[PDB]
Amino acid sequence: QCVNLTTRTQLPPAYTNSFTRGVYYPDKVFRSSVLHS
Amino acid sequence: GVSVITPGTNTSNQVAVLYQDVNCTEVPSNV
Amino acid sequence: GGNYNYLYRLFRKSNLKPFERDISTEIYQAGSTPCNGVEGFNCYFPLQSYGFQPTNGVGYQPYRVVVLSFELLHAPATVCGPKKSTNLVKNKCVNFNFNGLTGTGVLTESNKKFLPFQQFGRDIADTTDAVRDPQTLEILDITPCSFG
Amino acid sequence: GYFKIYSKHTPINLVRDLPQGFSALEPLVDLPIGINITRFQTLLALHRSYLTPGDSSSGWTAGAAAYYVGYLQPRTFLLKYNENGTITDAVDCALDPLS
Ligand SMILES: *[C@@H]1O[C@H](CO)[C@@H](O[C@@H]2O[C@H](CO)[C@@H](O)[C@H](O)[C@H]2NC(C)=O)[C@H](O)[C@H]1NC(C)=O
Ligand SMILES: *[C@@H]1O[C@H](CO)[C@@H](O[C@@H]2O[C@H](CO)[C@@H](O)[C@H](O)[C@H]2NC(C)=O)[C@H](O)[C@H]1NC(C)=O
Ligand SMILES: *[C@@H]1O[C@H](CO)[C@@H](O)[C@H](O)[C@H]1NC(C)=O
Ligand SMILES: *[C@@H]1O[C@H](CO)[C@@H](O)[C@H](O)[C@H]1NC(C)=O
Ligand SMILES: *[C@@H]1O[C@H](CO)[C@@H](O)[C@H](O)[C@H]1NC(C)=O
Ligand SMILES: *[C@@H]1O[C@H](CO)[C@@H](O)[C@H](O)[C@H]1NC(C)=O
Numbered sequence: 001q002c003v004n005l006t007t008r009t010q011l012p013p014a015y016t017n018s019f020t021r022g023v024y025y026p027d028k029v030f031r032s033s034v035l036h037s
Numbered sequence: 038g039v040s041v042i043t044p045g046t047n048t049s050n051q052v053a054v055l056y057q058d059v060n061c062t063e064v065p066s067n068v
Numbered sequence: 069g070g071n072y073n074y075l076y077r078l079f080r081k082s083n084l085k086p087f088e089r090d091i092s093t094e095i096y097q098a099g100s101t102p103c104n105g106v107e108g109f110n111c112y113f114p115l116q117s118y119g120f121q122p123t124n125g126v127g128y129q130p131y132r133v134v135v136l137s138f139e140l141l142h143a144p145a146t147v148c149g150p151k152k153s154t155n156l157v158k159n160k161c162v163n164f165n166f167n168g169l170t171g172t173g174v175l176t177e178s179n180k181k182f183l184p185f186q187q188f189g190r191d192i193a194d195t196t197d198a199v200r201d202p203q204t205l206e207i208l209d210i211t212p213c214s215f216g
Numbered sequence: 217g218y219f220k221i222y223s224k225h226t227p228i229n230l231v232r233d234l235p236q237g238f239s240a241l242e243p244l245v246d247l248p249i250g251i252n253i254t255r256f257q258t259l260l261a262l263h264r265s266y267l268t269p270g271d272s273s274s275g276w277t278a279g280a281a282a283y284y285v286g287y288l289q290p291r292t293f294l295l296k297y298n299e300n301g302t303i304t305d306a307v308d309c310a311l312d313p314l315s
Contacts, residue, residue, distance in 0.1 A: 005273050016233045018286055023293065023306055024222040024241035030186035030198065031297040037309075041313050052313045143250040144217035183301045185242060 070119035074130065079114045087137075156201055161213035166199045171210065178207035217250035234284065240303040258283065 042053040061068050079096040097103045099110030107113060120130050151167075158175045165171075169188060178198060182189065189198035189207075198209050222241040262276040269275075295306045309315050 001271070003271060003273055003276070005276075007273075016284065018234055018284075019236055020238055020306070021234055022241070022286065022288075023238075023295070023303060025183075025185070025243065025303065028185060028187040030182045030189035030301050032180070032189065032301060033299050034190075034192055034297050035294060036297065037292060037294045043314065046314075050314060054313055144248055146248070181300060183242070186301060 070121050071130075072117045072119055074120065075115045075117045077114055078116045079112060153203070156208075158208075167202055169196060169199060171196060173210045173212050176209045176211065178209045180207055180209075182207055217248065219245075219247040219249050219251065219253075221245050221247075238305055 038057040040055040040057065042055065043049075044051070056064055077090070079098075080090065084090065093113075093115065095103045095105055095107065096112045096114045097110065098112060101110060103111035118130070120128075156175065158177065161172065161174055163172050164175065166188070180189065180198060182198075182200060187200055188196055191197045196210060198207055200207050221244045223244045224239050224241045226235075226237075226239050228235050260278070260281055262278045265275050265277050292309050293306050294309065295303050298304050307315055
């Protein structure tokens with residue numbers, strides 16, 4: 001029931017710069033102005 | 038050891054680096 | 069009149085492996101003579117039926133059975149018993165457990181505001197000093213039991 | 217054996233790339249699975265065209281789709297918390313000399 005969709009594209013994917021993204025809270029622990037490494 | 042020489046972040050963010058008693062030809066401008 | 073819908077297998081080549089299951093219905097072959105899919109001497113249908121009837125002595129009446137089998141593969145966790153609780157008291161040196169956090173001290177109403185996924189708060193030098201009550205979801209400070 | 221998902225939604229203006237600011241990601245779910253994962257793929261939604269009877273690639277219409285994919289690595293991060301409990305900024309050591 002599934003379709004051939006893929007058209008061959010010569011172009012490669014580009015590259016960008018993740019300046020400062022993708023940071024998360026690695027713990028349910030709460031904190032208040034504590035510099036944590 | 039490796040030491041970092043900084044004028045202070047309230048002045049600049051440039052930095053210099055001292056490789057202690059290492060001959061400067063085997064470290065890996067101003068050398 | 070007899071409930072003939074409850075069958076059981078009474079002939080098999082070899083005993084089952086544990087937790088193995090066999091719903092086939094091939095004609096059993098007792099003797100050496102091949103069977104060719106027809107009944108006869110030493111060629112038996114392998115399923116019999118309890119004919120249950122309400123006027124049967126105990127030990128012939130139907131019993132329903134459920135077998136619970138707890139297994140422990142190598143995952144991270146799963147189902148288990150249920151949890152209980154008590155009554156979060158305040159202003160008394162107490163011995164507390166907050167869904168895992170075990171401690172001692174006086175509990176007091178707070179005025180800090182966690183983010184709505186944070187359970188407990190820590191100090192500098194890393195000691196638990198606030199918690200959130202799981203049931204009512206309010207922040208409570210934890211001060212130590214007076215000593216000296 | 218756990219599958220953890222973190223998420224964030226942020227409004228930005230017309231930039232060609234990822235923005236320059238800072239935004240932390242709050243956790244969504246921690247699914248207890250125990251699944252061995254080495255590959256993944258993205259699901260896209262296509263609409264049925266109704267201008268042709270067939271099911272082929274001409275029978276489905278679509279807009280424009282693009283995304284950004286980067287890979288995680290074990291690093292050490294210094295996080296600066298706020299008084300409300302909010303990571304407002306951070307730095308990744310082993311990044312440069314000063315860091
Ligand atoms: C879990 O159930 C308890 C009650 O069994 C809920 O407690 C209620 O909390 C509200 C606060 O919004 C009070 O107004 C009610 O009077 C409480 N009920 C009782 C019987 O004390 C509790 O809120 C539930 N958990 C969650 C997350 O909602
Ligand atoms: C998870 O699945 C991958 C499948 O790729 C396992 O990694 C190895 O993959 C190569 C590529 O086909 C195989 O030739 C190897 O035999 C796989 N390793 C092993 C030990 O079989 C990976 O091991 C799997 N992880 C777990 C925990 O089973
Ligand atoms: C396209 O679909 C046909 C069946 O509709 C299939 O036989 C063929 O392998 C598909 N093409 C590719 C490149 O897989
Ligand atoms: C530090 O910064 C403050 C304000 O940015 C400035 O007044 C002060 O002179 C700075 N100190 C030095 C040593 O530059
Ligand atoms: C470093 O090595 C070079 C090459 O032998 C040598 O000429 C130089 O003197 C060495 N450094 C010092 C401080 O002697
Ligand atoms: C969060 O901190 C800001 C200052 O950074 C303060 O003005 C505000 O009252 C705090 N609390 C909130 C938003 O609940």
